[PDB]
A paper describes a structure:
We next determined cryo-EM structures of the GluA2–TARPγ2 receptor under two different pH conditions in an apo state (in the absence of l-glutamate). To protonate the receptor, we lowered the pH with citrate buffer immediately before vitrification (to pH ~5.5). Our cryo-EM structures reveal that protons lead to stark conformational changes throughout the GluA2–TARPγ2 complex that are most pronounced in the NTD tier. When comparing the LBD sector between the two pH conditions, we noticed greater conformational heterogeneity of the LBDs at pH 5.5 versus pH 8.0, which is reflected in the local resolution maps of the consensus refinement. Atomic models derived from the consensus refinements reveal differences in the LBD tier between the average LBD structures at pH 5.5 and pH 8.0, with larger displacements of the BD LBDs versus the AC LBDs in the pH 5.5 receptor. These lead to an approximation of the LBD upper (D1) lobes between the BD subunits at pH 5.5 and to rearrangements of their G helices (inset), which mark LBD conformations in different states of the gating cycle. While protons also target the LBD tier directly, as evident from strong, pH-dependent changes in GluA2delNTD desensitization, the lack of NTD BD contacts amplifies conformational rearrangements in the LBD and TMD sectors that are associated with desensitization. Taken together, protonation induces multiple changes throughout the receptor assembly, including rupture of the NTD tier, rearrangements of the LBD pairs and rotational movements of the TARPs, culminating in reduced charge transfer through the receptor channel.
Numbering used by the authors:
A (entry chain F): 5 to 42, 55 to 162, 173 to 214
B (entry chain C): 425 to 506, 511 to 523
C (entry chain C): 573 to 773, 784 to 825
D (entry chain B): 524 to 551, 567 to 671
E (entry chain D): 771 to 773, 781 to 819
F (entry chain B): 721 to 770
G (entry chain A): 672 to 720
Write the structure that this text describes.
Amino acid sequence: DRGVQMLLTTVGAFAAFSLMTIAVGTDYWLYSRGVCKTEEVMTHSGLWRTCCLEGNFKGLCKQIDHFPEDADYEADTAEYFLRAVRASSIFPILSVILLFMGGLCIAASEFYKTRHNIILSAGIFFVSAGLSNIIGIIVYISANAGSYSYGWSFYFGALSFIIAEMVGVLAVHMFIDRHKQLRATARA
Amino acid sequence: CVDLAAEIAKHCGFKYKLTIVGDGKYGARDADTKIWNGMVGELVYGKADIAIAPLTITLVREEVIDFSKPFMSLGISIMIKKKPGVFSFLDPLAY
Amino acid sequence: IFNSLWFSLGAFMQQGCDISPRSLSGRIVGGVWWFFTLIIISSYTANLAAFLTVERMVSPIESAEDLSKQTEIAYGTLDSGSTKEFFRRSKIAVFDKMWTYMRSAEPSVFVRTTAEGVARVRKSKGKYAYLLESTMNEYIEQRKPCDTMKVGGNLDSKGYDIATPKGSSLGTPVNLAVLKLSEQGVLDKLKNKWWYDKGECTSALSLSNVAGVFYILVGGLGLAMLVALIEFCYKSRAEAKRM
Amino acid sequence: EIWMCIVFAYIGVSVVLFLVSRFSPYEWSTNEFGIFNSLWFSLGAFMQQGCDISPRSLSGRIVGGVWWFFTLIIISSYTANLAAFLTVERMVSPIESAEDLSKQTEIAYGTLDSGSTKEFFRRSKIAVFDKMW
Amino acid sequence: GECKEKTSALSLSNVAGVFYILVGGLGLAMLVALIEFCYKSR
Amino acid sequence: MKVGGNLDSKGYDIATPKGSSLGTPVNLAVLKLSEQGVLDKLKNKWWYDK
Amino acid sequence: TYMRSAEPSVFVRTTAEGVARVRKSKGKYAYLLESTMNEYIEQRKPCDT
């Protein structure tokens, strides 16, 4: 039905936004061993800083130096571009921005029933948020590559992409139904 | 060596004075004058009473200067210098 | 013209096509394009396999003999010292040929001083190898910027001992003390402390190898979405004005 | 990571193709690209098995083209890497140093019940040599 | 004495023949289509 | 097989009576074989070649 | 360093048997012998060496 579909869309959008916001803010993205407060000790790292685990310096988080200018090496401009993208975390942040925009537009869909084009904008925003989350995952993994494990915070972003993409399908399916309703009413 | 010298001095219970060889040479045999300089010559001529330094135990220095058992073993080693492009999937074919 | 480009793209990507040429000339074009596509795709796959196999076959130098056989990476000792004299007197098949390379080698790989030899190793990017003692090798390995690494075992055996003038009262007490320190672990502990405590320092294809294809895919998805919205807006504004 | 990103890219491509195929109210459906059919098309494209349908719009065709290029590169890379793995046999010892032995606990190790080796390790200040003692 | 398993990017000389065959086939197709059109016109 | 490295350093030598005159030529002759490579050659023939 | 430590021993009492050992080992065994007289063998039947 229409009401259950709208409720499911709202719940999915809220869940995706919450999951992606938690994943961006939380530090349990990658489990790896690294030097604390720059000895070797197992730590967990997020997007901005890493906190050491079961060590002498357990509990304090130190900001990851995204630019390793210790050797003053530049190599190619592509490496600098990728490093700048990873450091700013532009793509996960723009993914949460797009998710928030889509959710707010879905909420505003109730205010304006006649204007049907906005739910299409919500679907577009959800699809773009999913694509940007994928780009961010690819960039993050590539930067990390240049033993480890992925924590639940990283999988929260992965689950957020699936939920947001499922909602984008549902939102677009509504715009199809809305135009079918308009044409069917005009036909009769 | 200084911490090693401290243990040696502490074990034998004698005061030690740390100095530096003026020419900064480990010491080698000279064919022209047969006069030893550097680290090896300091002990022979009485300028030093004991040498605690990375001195290689060789035949030339052994036959005049008494060498203790090697406290550190070494040998000749090798020193060497210890990210794919984004479009590295087009590498197999030329541009 | 639009459908022809689509058929050609689908044929090159070796994917299904909704349409196929029916005339003689159209089928000739399709057949030659299919042969070209098959050859090119097989060539790409074969060359990538050769690249990966050759990379996997690359064995890094570990010991002297494997390094001795190859000649791609140059190496040399100091301009003086017992390192050169050891090579001349050595008659081992690994070591007799060792001397024979820098003797006939241009430019001269001999280095005036150790510091310059280490410095030229960093800029060599692995092209040059330096042969020094084992004890101080680890120290430079532990020095910044931590780009050099000691590999393999010691070629020969040497040692450092306390030097005492002959017929001195400090002869035997130091020798006993040297043995005492080694057997007490203090000498061993002191050796480990300064080198390390004071120190200043796969097979599967990774996502970095194929990140460009992901970037191109998502860029194409974004471009297609942009085109879809542009055409939708144009069509909507075309009919709204007409109505 | 490549497999995970392959699954994610497949889902994203299916959703984007379904969106660009059936969102426009001025294309009615002329095409058969629902969400289920878009998933089927993307799965068939990845496995190089083809399908009974093909996108007919410019945007859908762009999506199909980039997905086909991605699939070609990925499948060729998989085949090439499997060939490299089968051609060259690499064996790496699980333990390469005494420090690694201390880090692990699965493989047991010991020395003489009475000898110099056993008597050496008691008075060892080394952090590596003290932890595994 | 002072004195293979190599790999390199495939160059155009390695696959120039297939390009020649492709262009020849395009020319043959064009010629056949023109011949058919001329025959139908006559 | 041998893996890792030697954590401790030891030596293996010829024992002679304390103050025995023959000991000094023995140690010197031990050195002579070391520089000429006779010692390591004997090491290989009883460890590697055999 | 091979035939001293190898089971079975690769020593052959006579030249003729050593060639026959090679002719039986389908190429897994080799023989060392004088070059000129060996060249005489490879020109004889069945020319398998």
